[PDB]
RNA sequence: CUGAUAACUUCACGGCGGGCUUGAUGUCCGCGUCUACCUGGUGAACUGCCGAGUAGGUAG
């Protein structure tokens, strides 16, 4: 249990988001911000980033790609734990299939969870996916405030079973891969503000990249992947989802759920995996503390990270 | 040939700008009787923070002062020891003649400011020419703004909420018999008066 | 209640002359640093007029 070496590599890996501004003359230009340098009499930046006057809409773009790196550890000291883990993932996909996790990630891509506080004060936003490998025209999700609200409402779309099935083949098939390109249109009001990411300094300086000479804000690479992994709704007496860490950390209200006293963190669950291959070789599985722990373990191997001593 | 006094703020538990601003609010409460525009506000301390522990209003000829200092505001306030209106002392002539102007460029640096400015700029395209696309008036992408202090007041009959700004130039003592516009600063620009320390 | 008490060592003074360390010299062969990662503006500096004016003056 917990050798010197154990490490997994991540399955989902997204990229930076890029913001552009569309004009009524039918073009698009990058979005720029400004600092103001606060001087004394005879230093800290303050950055502001607002939508320019007379525009039409904001277009955001990024690209996410799902892979199969969860089926075998990147490192392992002992040929005793790897056998357990590969048949753990094999019994999980035999008994209780990949559709819950796949739908629960694709919902967070399709509604704009990665538009962190940018859809407050917004009229309509429209998300378009371009998947790969694929044959057909693009997969559109239109006006997510008043047309897409729940899991039953997404399933009444034309192109949903194919998207969740290619995510299932990516998580299942060894040497398998799916790639989605995402771009989303935001119709913000006149002179609405924009909230990108902020650099770590110990005020309010933005994260930026250069797009063809103009600097632009991005809203993160690691931030935008912490919004596709807000799926943790299985902790004891649950009410509200979480980023899938190992110690159930809710960010703003400082405290951590899933403390190791409760035994519902990753290590207390992981060290009882011979019980999970015990129960999943039977003929009935309870959905209250056995399915809700296999979901947490499989969502926490997809994240990756080194499980050492 | 006239004089200053210090309304001192001493409760030793107070924020200074938010008392000084409503002192200037009740200064604007005065001078609706008719436009007797003869008052300077004259904040005698000015650090790189903290608008001073004092305020020092000026009058002209010793009696208009106590029409201003009975401004329906300290009469129900000064039962106890919180402020101190200083008692009408002819000026010691060892001070410095400094300025107080509302500069209207702290207020028009914001993105709302050039939004208003560009929407005015073809509000009055009525000298009819070829209309521009507004896709090129990109803002000042790096700006070094100097020191300023802000006072939080509001509009005189409407619910419009601006602020007002103060700087501390030093300039040219002798000029005229010192009228201004309404509430107390020296951005009149017909007679831009220094009112001393 | 001190092997007790007391106890001005000092003046002068030229170490100099001379001196070729050199000859020769292959350090090289091999080499995977890798896995994981939300810094946040609670709401928050408005609405106008003149200026041919991203510059400049105003009223509240």
Coordinates of C-alpha atoms (C1' of nucleotides) in Angstrom, one line a residue:
Chain A
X1 CA 0.0 0.0 0.0
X2 CA 1.4 3.3 -1.3
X3 CA 4.9 2.4 -2.6
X4 CA 7.9 4.7 -3.0
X5 CA 6.9 5.4 -6.6
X6 CA 3.4 5.8 -8.0
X7 CA 2.2 8.5 -10.5
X8 CA -0.5 8.9 -13.0
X9 CA -0.7 11.3 -16.0
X10 CA -3.8 13.3 -16.8
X11 CA -6.4 12.4 -19.4
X12 CA -8.1 15.8 -20.1
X13 CA -5.8 18.6 -21.0
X14 CA -7.2 22.0 -22.1
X15 CA -5.5 25.2 -23.4
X16 CA -5.7 28.9 -23.1
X17 CA -8.9 30.7 -24.0
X18 CA -8.6 33.6 -26.4
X19 CA -11.0 36.6 -26.5
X20 CA -11.8 38.5 -29.8
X21 CA -14.1 41.3 -30.7
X22 CA -16.4 41.3 -33.7
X23 CA -17.5 44.5 -35.5
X24 CA -20.5 45.2 -37.7
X25 CA -18.1 45.5 -40.7
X26 CA -17.7 41.6 -40.3
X27 CA -14.2 41.1 -39.0
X28 CA -12.6 40.3 -35.6
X29 CA -9.7 41.9 -33.7
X30 CA -8.0 40.9 -30.4
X31 CA -9.1 42.4 -27.1
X32 CA -6.7 44.7 -25.3
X33 CA -6.6 46.1 -21.7
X34 CA -4.8 48.9 -19.9
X35 CA -2.9 49.4 -16.7
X36 CA -2.8 52.6 -14.8
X37 CA 0.3 53.3 -12.8
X38 CA -0.5 54.8 -9.4
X39 CA 2.1 57.4 -8.5
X40 CA 2.7 59.2 -5.2
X41 CA 3.5 62.9 -4.7
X42 CA 6.7 65.0 -4.7
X43 CA 4.0 51.1 -7.1
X44 CA 1.1 48.8 -8.0
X45 CA -0.6 48.3 -11.3
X46 CA -4.4 48.2 -11.6
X47 CA -5.6 46.6 -14.8
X48 CA -9.1 47.2 -16.4
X49 CA -10.5 45.4 -19.4
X50 CA -13.9 46.5 -20.8
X51 CA -15.7 45.8 -24.1
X52 CA -15.1 48.5 -26.6
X53 CA -17.8 50.8 -27.8
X54 CA -19.8 50.0 -30.9
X55 CA -18.8 46.3 -31.1
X56 CA -21.1 43.4 -31.7
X57 CA -20.0 40.4 -29.6
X58 CA -17.1 38.6 -28.0
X59 CA -15.8 35.3 -29.4
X60 CA -13.9 32.9 -27.1
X61 CA -11.9 30.0 -28.3
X62 CA -10.0 27.0 -26.9
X63 CA -9.4 23.3 -27.5
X64 CA -9.7 20.3 -25.3
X65 CA -8.6 16.7 -26.0
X66 CA -9.5 13.5 -24.2
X67 CA -7.1 10.6 -24.0
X68 CA -6.6 7.2 -22.4
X69 CA -3.8 7.8 -20.0
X70 CA -5.7 6.6 -16.9
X71 CA -5.5 2.9 -17.7
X72 CA -1.9 2.3 -16.4
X73 CA 0.3 4.2 -14.1
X74 CA 3.1 6.4 -15.5
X75 CA 5.3 5.1 -12.6
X76 CA 5.1 2.1 -10.2
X77 CA 7.7 0.6 -7.9
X78 CA 6.1 -2.8 -7.5
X79 CA 4.3 -5.3 -9.7
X80 CA 1.6 -5.9 -7.1
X81 CA -0.2 -2.6 -7.1
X82 CA -0.3 -2.2 -10.9
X83 CA -2.2 -5.5 -11.4
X84 CA -4.8 -4.3 -8.9
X85 CA -5.2 -0.9 -10.6
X86 CA -5.5 -2.2 -14.2
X87 CA -8.1 -4.7 -13.2
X88 CA -9.8 -2.0 -11.1
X89 CA -10.3 0.1 -14.2
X90 CA -11.3 -3.0 -16.3
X91 CA -14.0 -4.1 -13.8
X92 CA -15.2 -0.5 -13.6
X93 CA -15.8 -0.3 -17.3
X94 CA -17.2 -3.8 -17.5
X95 CA -19.8 -3.3 -14.7
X96 CA -20.7 0.4 -14.4
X97 CA -19.9 2.1 -17.7
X98 CA -18.2 5.3 -18.7
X99 CA -21.3 7.3 -19.4
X100 CA -21.8 9.1 -16.1
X101 CA -18.4 10.7 -16.0
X102 CA -18.5 11.5 -19.8
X103 CA -21.9 13.2 -19.6
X104 CA -20.8 15.0 -16.5
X105 CA -17.7 16.5 -18.2
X106 CA -19.4 17.2 -21.5
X107 CA -22.1 19.2 -19.6
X108 CA -19.4 21.5 -18.2
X109 CA -18.0 22.0 -21.7
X110 CA -21.3 22.6 -23.4
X111 CA -22.9 25.3 -21.1
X112 CA -20.0 27.7 -20.5
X113 CA -18.7 26.8 -17.0
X114 CA -15.3 27.9 -18.3
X115 CA -16.7 31.4 -18.7
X116 CA -15.9 32.2 -15.1
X117 CA -18.2 35.1 -14.0
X118 CA -18.4 36.3 -17.6
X119 CA -22.0 35.2 -18.2
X120 CA -23.4 37.3 -15.3
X121 CA -24.9 40.3 -17.0
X122 CA -25.2 38.6 -20.4
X123 CA -28.0 38.3 -22.9
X124 CA -27.3 35.1 -24.8
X125 CA -24.3 32.9 -25.4
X126 CA -23.9 30.2 -28.0
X127 CA -21.4 27.4 -28.0
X128 CA -20.2 25.6 -31.1
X129 CA -18.1 22.4 -31.0
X130 CA -16.0 20.9 -33.8
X131 CA -15.1 17.3 -32.9
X132 CA -12.4 15.0 -34.3
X133 CA -12.7 12.4 -35.7
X134 CA -16.0 13.3 -37.2
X135 CA -18.1 13.4 -40.3
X136 CA -20.8 16.2 -40.6
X137 CA -21.3 19.9 -39.8
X138 CA -20.6 21.4 -36.5
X139 CA -22.4 20.6 -33.2
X140 CA -24.3 23.7 -32.0
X141 CA -25.8 24.5 -28.6
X142 CA -27.9 27.6 -28.8
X143 CA -29.0 30.1 -26.1
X144 CA -28.0 28.2 -23.0
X145 CA -29.9 30.4 -20.6
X146 CA -33.4 29.7 -22.0
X147 CA -32.8 26.5 -24.0
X148 CA -30.5 24.2 -22.1
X149 CA -30.9 23.7 -18.3
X150 CA -30.6 20.1 -17.3
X151 CA -29.2 16.6 -18.2
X152 CA -32.5 15.5 -19.7
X153 CA -32.6 18.7 -21.9
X154 CA -29.2 18.0 -23.4
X155 CA -30.1 14.5 -24.3
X156 CA -32.9 15.8 -26.6
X157 CA -30.3 17.1 -29.0
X158 CA -29.4 15.5 -32.4
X159 CA -25.7 15.3 -31.9
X160 CA -25.3 14.1 -28.3
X161 CA -25.0 10.3 -28.4
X162 CA -22.2 10.5 -30.9
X163 CA -20.2 13.0 -28.8
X164 CA -20.6 11.0 -25.6
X165 CA -19.8 7.8 -27.5
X166 CA -16.5 9.2 -28.9
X167 CA -15.6 10.3 -25.4
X168 CA -16.4 6.8 -24.2
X169 CA -14.2 5.2 -26.9
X170 CA -11.4 7.6 -25.9
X171 CA -11.5 6.6 -22.3
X172 CA -11.9 2.9 -23.2
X173 CA -9.8 2.0 -26.2
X174 CA -6.0 1.8 -25.6
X175 CA -4.1 4.2 -27.8
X176 CA -7.4 6.2 -28.3
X177 CA -8.0 9.9 -28.6
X178 CA -10.7 12.5 -29.1
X179 CA -10.2 16.2 -29.8
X180 CA -12.8 19.0 -29.5
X181 CA -12.4 22.6 -30.7
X182 CA -14.7 24.9 -28.8
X183 CA -15.7 28.5 -29.6
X184 CA -18.4 30.4 -27.8
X185 CA -20.2 33.7 -28.7
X186 CA -21.1 36.1 -25.9
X187 CA -23.5 39.1 -26.5
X188 CA -22.5 41.2 -23.6
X189 CA -24.2 44.7 -23.0
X190 CA -22.7 48.0 -24.0
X191 CA -19.4 48.7 -22.1
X192 CA -19.6 45.5 -20.1
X193 CA -16.5 44.5 -18.2
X194 CA -14.5 41.4 -18.8
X195 CA -13.0 39.2 -16.0
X196 CA -9.8 37.3 -17.1
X197 CA -7.4 35.4 -14.9
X198 CA -4.9 37.1 -12.5
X199 CA -1.3 36.5 -11.9
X200 CA -0.1 35.2 -8.5
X201 CA 1.4 38.2 -6.6
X202 CA 1.4 38.6 -2.8
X203 CA -2.9 44.3 -7.1
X204 CA -5.1 42.9 -9.9
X205 CA -2.6 42.3 -12.7
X206 CA -3.9 40.1 -15.6
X207 CA -2.5 37.1 -17.3
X208 CA -1.7 37.9 -20.9
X209 CA -0.2 36.6 -24.1
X210 CA 0.9 38.3 -27.3
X211 CA -1.4 37.7 -30.4
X212 CA 0.2 39.2 -33.5
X213 CA 1.7 42.3 -31.8
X214 CA -1.3 43.1 -29.5
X215 CA -1.2 41.9 -25.9
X216 CA -4.4 40.1 -24.9
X217 CA -5.8 38.6 -21.7
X218 CA -6.3 34.8 -21.7
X219 CA -8.2 33.4 -18.6
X220 CA -5.8 30.7 -17.9
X221 CA -4.7 27.2 -19.0
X222 CA -4.9 25.5 -15.5
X223 CA -7.9 27.6 -14.5
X224 CA -10.0 26.5 -17.5
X225 CA -9.3 22.8 -16.7
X226 CA -10.5 23.4 -13.1
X227 CA -13.9 24.2 -14.6
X228 CA -14.3 21.0 -16.6
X229 CA -13.5 19.1 -13.4
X230 CA -16.2 20.6 -11.1
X231 CA -18.1 17.3 -10.9
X232 CA -17.6 16.3 -7.2
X233 CA -21.1 15.9 -5.9
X234 CA -20.6 12.6 -3.9
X235 CA -19.2 13.8 -0.6
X236 CA -21.3 13.0 2.6
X237 CA -24.5 15.1 2.8
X238 CA -23.7 16.8 -0.4
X239 CA -25.3 19.9 -1.8
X240 CA -23.0 21.7 -4.3
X241 CA -20.2 20.5 -6.6
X242 CA -16.5 20.7 -6.1
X243 CA -13.2 20.5 -8.0
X244 CA -12.1 16.9 -7.8
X245 CA -9.1 17.1 -5.5
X246 CA -8.1 14.6 -2.9
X247 CA -9.3 16.5 0.1
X248 CA -12.6 18.1 -1.0
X249 CA -11.4 21.7 -0.9
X250 CA -14.1 24.3 -1.3
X251 CA -12.2 27.4 -2.1
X252 CA -13.9 30.6 -0.8
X253 CA -15.4 29.3 2.5
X254 CA -12.0 28.1 3.5
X255 CA -12.8 24.7 5.1
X256 CA -12.2 21.4 3.3
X257 CA -14.8 18.7 3.0
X258 CA -13.7 15.1 2.8
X259 CA -11.2 15.4 5.7
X260 CA -9.4 12.1 6.4
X261 CA -11.3 11.9 9.8
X262 CA -14.4 11.2 7.7
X263 CA -12.5 8.6 5.6
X264 CA -13.9 10.0 2.3
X265 CA -10.6 11.3 0.9
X266 CA -8.6 9.7 -1.9
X267 CA -6.1 7.8 0.2
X268 CA -8.6 6.1 2.7
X269 CA -10.7 5.1 -0.3
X270 CA -7.7 4.0 -2.4
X271 CA -6.3 1.8 0.4
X272 CA -9.5 -0.2 0.3
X273 CA -9.5 -1.2 -3.4
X274 CA -9.5 -4.9 -2.8
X275 CA -12.9 -4.3 -1.3
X276 CA -14.0 -2.6 -4.5
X277 CA -12.9 -5.5 -6.7
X278 CA -14.6 -7.7 -4.0
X279 CA -18.0 -5.9 -4.4
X280 CA -17.9 -5.3 -8.2
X281 CA -17.5 -9.0 -8.9
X282 CA -20.9 -9.7 -7.3
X283 CA -24.3 -9.3 -9.0
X284 CA -25.7 -6.1 -7.4
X285 CA -24.0 -2.8 -6.4
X286 CA -25.3 -0.2 -3.9
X287 CA -25.4 3.4 -5.1
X288 CA -24.8 5.0 -1.7
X289 CA -21.3 4.2 -0.6
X290 CA -19.9 1.9 -3.3
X291 CA -20.9 3.4 -6.6
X292 CA -20.3 6.9 -5.1
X293 CA -16.7 5.9 -4.2
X294 CA -15.8 4.2 -7.5
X295 CA -17.0 7.4 -9.2
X296 CA -14.7 9.4 -7.0
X297 CA -11.7 7.1 -7.5
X298 CA -12.1 7.0 -11.3
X299 CA -12.6 10.8 -11.4
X300 CA -9.4 11.1 -9.3
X301 CA -7.2 8.9 -11.5
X302 CA -8.2 11.0 -14.6
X303 CA -6.8 14.0 -12.8
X304 CA -3.4 12.4 -12.3
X305 CA -0.8 13.3 -9.8
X306 CA 1.7 11.3 -7.8
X307 CA 0.3 9.0 -5.1
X308 CA 3.5 8.5 -3.0
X309 CA 4.4 8.2 0.6
Chain B
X1 CA -6.1 91.3 4.5
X2 CA -8.3 88.5 5.9
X3 CA -8.0 85.5 7.9
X4 CA -8.4 81.7 8.5
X5 CA -9.5 79.4 11.3
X6 CA -9.2 75.7 11.8
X7 CA -12.3 73.5 12.3
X8 CA -10.3 70.7 13.9
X9 CA -11.5 67.1 13.8
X10 CA -10.7 65.4 17.2
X11 CA -12.8 62.4 18.2
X12 CA -9.6 60.3 17.6
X13 CA -11.8 57.7 15.9
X14 CA -12.8 58.9 12.5
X15 CA -12.1 58.7 8.8
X16 CA -11.0 62.0 7.5
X17 CA -12.1 62.3 3.9
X18 CA -15.6 61.2 4.7
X19 CA -16.1 64.0 7.2
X20 CA -14.3 66.6 5.1
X21 CA -16.5 65.8 2.1
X22 CA -19.7 66.3 4.0
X23 CA -18.3 69.5 5.5
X24 CA -18.0 70.6 1.9
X25 CA -21.5 69.2 1.2
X26 CA -23.0 71.5 3.9
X27 CA -20.7 74.3 2.5
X28 CA -22.7 73.7 -0.8
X29 CA -25.8 73.8 1.5
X30 CA -24.8 77.4 2.1
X31 CA -24.7 79.8 -0.9
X32 CA -28.1 79.0 -2.3
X33 CA -29.4 82.2 -0.6
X34 CA -28.0 83.9 -3.6
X35 CA -24.6 83.4 -5.4
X36 CA -22.4 84.9 -2.7
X37 CA -19.4 83.0 -4.0
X38 CA -16.8 84.0 -1.6
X39 CA -15.6 80.9 0.3
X40 CA -12.4 78.8 0.0
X41 CA -12.1 75.4 1.7
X42 CA -8.3 75.2 2.1
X43 CA -7.4 71.7 3.4
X44 CA -4.2 72.7 5.3
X45 CA -2.6 69.3 5.4
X46 CA -1.9 67.1 2.3
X47 CA 0.2 64.0 2.6
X48 CA 0.7 61.2 0.0
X49 CA -2.4 59.8 1.8
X50 CA -4.9 61.0 4.4
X51 CA -6.6 64.4 3.6
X52 CA -5.9 66.3 6.8
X53 CA -7.2 66.3 10.3
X54 CA -8.3 69.9 9.8
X55 CA -10.5 72.0 7.6
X56 CA -10.0 75.7 7.2
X57 CA -12.8 77.7 5.6
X58 CA -12.2 81.3 4.8
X59 CA -14.6 84.3 4.7
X60 CA -14.2 87.9 3.7
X61 CA -15.1 90.4 6.4
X62 CA -15.8 88.8 9.8
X63 CA -19.6 88.6 9.8
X64 CA -20.3 86.5 6.7
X65 CA -18.2 83.9 8.4
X66 CA -20.8 83.4 11.2
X67 CA -23.5 83.3 8.6
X68 CA -21.5 80.4 7.2
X69 CA -20.6 78.9 10.5
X70 CA -24.2 78.7 11.7
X71 CA -25.0 76.4 8.8
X72 CA -27.8 74.4 10.7
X73 CA -25.2 71.6 11.1
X74 CA -23.0 72.1 14.2
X75 CA -25.8 73.6 16.3
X76 CA -27.3 70.1 16.9
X77 CA -23.8 68.6 16.6
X78 CA -21.6 70.5 19.1
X79 CA -23.3 69.6 22.4
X80 CA -20.2 67.4 23.1
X81 CA -16.5 67.6 22.2
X82 CA -16.0 66.1 18.7
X83 CA -15.0 69.1 16.5
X84 CA -13.5 72.5 17.3
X85 CA -14.4 75.6 15.3
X86 CA -11.5 78.0 15.9
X87 CA -12.4 81.5 17.1
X88 CA -11.8 84.1 14.4
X89 CA -8.1 84.9 14.6
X90 CA -6.4 87.5 12.3
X91 CA -4.0 85.7 10.0
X92 CA -0.3 85.2 10.8
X93 CA 1.4 86.1 7.6
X94 CA 4.0 83.3 7.7
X95 CA 2.3 80.6 5.5
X96 CA 2.4 79.5 1.9
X97 CA -0.1 80.4 -0.9
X98 CA -1.2 77.0 -2.3
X99 CA -4.0 76.0 -4.7
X100 CA -7.0 73.6 -4.7
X101 CA -8.4 72.7 -8.1
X102 CA -10.8 70.0 -9.3
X103 CA -9.0 68.7 -12.3
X104 CA -11.6 66.5 -14.2
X105 CA -8.9 64.2 -15.6
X106 CA -8.9 61.7 -12.8
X107 CA -12.7 61.4 -13.6
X108 CA -12.2 61.1 -17.4
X109 CA -9.5 58.4 -17.4
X110 CA -12.1 55.6 -16.7
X111 CA -13.5 53.4 -19.5
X112 CA -16.9 54.9 -18.9
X113 CA -15.2 58.3 -19.6
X114 CA -14.0 57.6 -23.1
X115 CA -17.2 55.7 -23.7
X116 CA -19.1 58.9 -23.0
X117 CA -16.5 60.8 -25.1
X118 CA -16.7 58.6 -28.2
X119 CA -20.5 58.6 -28.0
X120 CA -20.4 62.4 -27.8
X121 CA -17.9 62.5 -30.7
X122 CA -20.6 61.3 -33.1
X123 CA -23.4 62.8 -31.1
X124 CA -22.1 66.0 -32.8
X125 CA -21.1 64.7 -36.3
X126 CA -23.8 67.1 -37.4
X127 CA -21.1 69.0 -39.2
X128 CA -21.9 66.4 -41.8
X129 CA -18.9 64.5 -43.2
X130 CA -17.9 60.9 -43.6
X131 CA -18.6 58.9 -40.5
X132 CA -15.8 56.9 -39.0
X133 CA -15.9 53.4 -37.8
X134 CA -15.2 53.6 -34.0
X135 CA -13.0 50.5 -34.2
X136 CA -9.8 52.6 -33.9
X137 CA -10.2 54.8 -30.8
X138 CA -8.4 52.2 -28.6
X139 CA -7.6 53.5 -25.1
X140 CA -4.3 54.5 -23.6
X141 CA -2.9 51.1 -23.1
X142 CA -0.3 52.3 -20.5
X143 CA -0.8 55.3 -18.3
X144 CA 1.1 56.8 -15.3
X145 CA -1.4 58.8 -13.3
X146 CA -0.2 61.1 -10.5
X147 CA -1.4 61.7 -6.9
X148 CA -5.0 62.6 -6.2
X149 CA -7.6 62.4 -3.4
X150 CA -11.3 61.8 -3.9
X151 CA -14.4 63.2 -2.1
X152 CA -17.7 61.3 -2.3
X153 CA -20.6 63.7 -2.8
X154 CA -23.8 63.5 -4.9
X155 CA -25.9 65.7 -7.2
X156 CA -27.9 68.7 -5.9
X157 CA -31.4 67.6 -6.8
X158 CA -31.0 64.4 -8.8
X159 CA -29.7 61.0 -7.8
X160 CA -26.4 61.3 -9.7
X161 CA -23.4 60.1 -7.9
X162 CA -20.0 61.5 -8.9
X163 CA -16.9 62.3 -6.8
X164 CA -14.7 65.3 -6.7
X165 CA -10.9 65.6 -6.8
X166 CA -8.3 67.9 -5.1
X167 CA -4.7 68.7 -5.9
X168 CA -2.2 71.1 -4.2
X169 CA -0.5 73.4 -6.7
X170 CA 1.5 76.4 -5.4
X171 CA 1.1 79.6 -7.4
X172 CA 1.2 83.5 -7.5
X173 CA -0.3 85.0 -4.3
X174 CA -1.8 88.4 -5.3
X175 CA -4.8 88.2 -7.6
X176 CA -8.1 90.1 -7.2
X177 CA -10.8 90.1 -4.5
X178 CA -11.4 86.3 -4.8
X179 CA -14.8 85.2 -6.0
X180 CA -15.3 81.6 -7.2
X181 CA -18.0 79.3 -8.6
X182 CA -20.4 77.6 -6.1
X183 CA -18.9 75.0 -3.8
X184 CA -15.6 76.2 -2.6
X185 CA -12.7 75.0 -4.8
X186 CA -10.6 77.3 -7.1
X187 CA -11.4 75.9 -10.6
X188 CA -13.2 79.0 -11.6
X189 CA -10.7 79.8 -14.4
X190 CA -11.8 83.5 -14.6
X191 CA -10.0 84.1 -11.3
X192 CA -8.0 81.1 -10.2
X193 CA -7.2 82.2 -6.6
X194 CA -4.7 80.7 -4.2
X195 CA -6.1 80.4 -0.7
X196 CA -3.3 79.8 1.8
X197 CA -2.1 77.3 4.3
Chain C
rC1 C1' 50.9 45.1 59.2
rU2 C1' 53.2 42.6 52.3
rG3 C1' 61.7 38.4 52.8
rA4 C1' 59.1 45.6 56.2
rU5 C1' 60.0 51.2 55.3
rA6 C1' 64.0 54.0 51.0
rA7 C1' 65.9 53.3 45.9
rC8 C1' 66.6 58.8 38.3
rU9 C1' 72.0 53.4 34.5
rU10 C1' 73.7 56.7 30.5
rC11 C1' 76.6 59.3 26.4
rA12 C1' 78.4 58.3 20.7
rC13 C1' 77.6 54.9 16.5
rG14 C1' 78.0 54.9 7.3
rG15 C1' 77.8 46.5 6.0
rC16 C1' 79.2 47.4 1.2
rG17 C1' 81.1 45.6 -4.0
rG18 C1' 79.7 41.4 -8.4
rG19 C1' 76.3 37.7 -10.7
rC20 C1' 72.2 34.2 -18.3
rU21 C1' 68.4 28.9 -14.7
rU22 C1' 67.4 25.9 -19.3
rG23 C1' 66.1 21.6 -23.0
rA24 C1' 61.3 18.1 -24.4
rU25 C1' 56.0 17.1 -23.6
rG26 C1' 48.4 13.9 -27.5
rU27 C1' 44.2 13.5 -21.0
rC28 C1' 40.1 10.4 -23.4
rC29 C1' 35.9 6.6 -24.3
rG30 C1' 30.0 6.3 -22.5
rC31 C1' 25.4 9.2 -20.7
rG32 C1' 16.5 9.9 -21.4
rU33 C1' 15.3 14.5 -15.1
rC34 C1' 9.8 13.1 -15.1
rU35 C1' 4.4 13.1 -13.0
rA36 C1' 0.1 17.1 -10.5
rC37 C1' -1.9 22.5 -9.9
rC38 C1' -8.8 28.0 -10.1
rU39 C1' -5.3 34.2 -6.9
rG40 C1' -9.8 36.8 -6.4
rG41 C1' -12.2 43.6 -8.2
rU42 C1' -19.2 40.9 -3.9
rG43 C1' -22.4 45.3 -5.8
rA44 C1' -18.3 49.1 -6.9
rA45 C1' -15.9 57.1 -10.1
rC46 C1' -22.7 59.1 -13.2
rU47 C1' -25.5 62.2 -16.5
rG48 C1' -24.8 66.7 -19.7
rC49 C1' -22.9 71.1 -22.5
rC50 C1' -18.5 74.1 -25.6
rG51 C1' -14.3 72.8 -28.2
rA52 C1' -13.5 71.4 -36.7
rG53 C1' -10.1 68.4 -31.9
rU54 C1' -7.6 60.0 -28.3
rA55 C1' -5.1 67.0 -26.7
rG56 C1' -8.2 70.8 -23.9
rG57 C1' -12.4 73.9 -20.5
rU58 C1' -17.0 73.5 -17.9
rA59 C1' -22.3 72.4 -14.7
rG60 C1' -24.3 69.1 -11.0

